């Protein structure tokens, strides 16, 4: 994922592509807008990428779950027109978005952090205090334990540890000594197992962390974004011909290993086991992150809810936003009974609160009355068309209500959560709900790690939590919930 340059300007990107790149050389750079800079016929074109919180929208292109999925699509596929060819990624040397980089940091400060949070193989790279321009690799080893500092020299734009090979970037040096560990004169192996954790904080320290991130949130988000290519999971079922029109956005697909598999399908139907949905297990309650129903997937949605024994549905979108259909009406009108294939749904009662509508639905399979169960549909209606809410109170009051309903029903299946593509707002609500569940059970006496939780959820459905404004809103929701304890 080296092709993403987070600190490059427009002019610097053009110069980089003209001096160090050839025809086909590309790079991506960052309000939540991004630019895809491509060298063609000895000239640089700039393609705008927009993300309002739902997906990455390539202008005059396609919609995507991640920027890496966008890059892979056009590198593999005359699909990018204005034909623009994506051939050679121009690699970023800058280490700011790497978990191991720290910048201005002292030896004792690094030692203190490595003693406070680190274990065997924990490492960091910081700017040297004695020799300006030079760097220091500080690594931990043990089970007594010890911290080792290794000098990194910056000679004529290249990096080395005092001998052997010289590297173009600190990223190449780190990757080399990760694969080939340094061995001390007394046989101590300097294994670079994992970067030092710098995001896991105590729930009581949220107020000061948010104060530090408001001075910062973007920087922490990009470090998280730089790890999206670690998740090497197949999305083949969604790409099948017969499953293509079951996806709201053809490129936004579920992971095969966590997708909801629909059983008891129509025998006259070739492929009836598919729905664009994934099971989200926190690593007490589980979730189903899905897209908004299409006219041709309403029957599949009710089959999933039935099969999974789901009693609570969280809708985080209006049916229509900016004149576009974000989800078809998969529920009857109040007091009405409707049949959606083999599934029969009754709308018993609607209750309208300030930020949401609750619909009490009765679900059963046709031909068997005893299969009837109550499904509580929570429909959040006040979420803005673009960006995030100003105050997280409305969402916290909503999720507190969703949690208590789910908790009141014995042996309830996962909480169904959907929006448009089922990755942005869906991700935000699920991550906020997982974190608040920790704080509800353990109070202030618990460690919360916002980026780690997002990466754990993203390993189950790609694109979970789309923007920096959503990332920040998770911290503001968590902080607000802690303030009201």
Curated annotation (Swiss-Prot):
Listed result of changing residue 466 to P: In LPRD1; does not affect subcellular location; decreases protein tyrosine phosphatase activity against CDC73
Organism: Homo sapiens
Residues at the active site: 419
Paired cysteines (S-S): none
Record: disease: LEOPARD syndrome 1: A disorder characterized by lentigines, electrocardiographic conduction abnormalities, ocular hypertelorism, pulmonic stenosis, abnormalities of genitalia, retardation of growth, and sensorineural deafness.
This protein's name: Tyrosine-protein phosphatase non-receptor type 11
Catalytic activity, reaction form: O-phospho-L-tyrosyl-[protein] + H2O = L-tyrosyl-[protein] + phosphate
InterPro entries: Prot-tyrosine_phosphatase-like, PTP_cat, SH2, SH2_dom_sf, Tyr_Pase_AS, Tyr_Pase_cat, Tyr_Pase_dom, Tyr_Pase_non-rcpt_typ-6/11
Tissues expressing this chain: Widely expressed, with highest levels in heart, brain, and skeletal muscle.
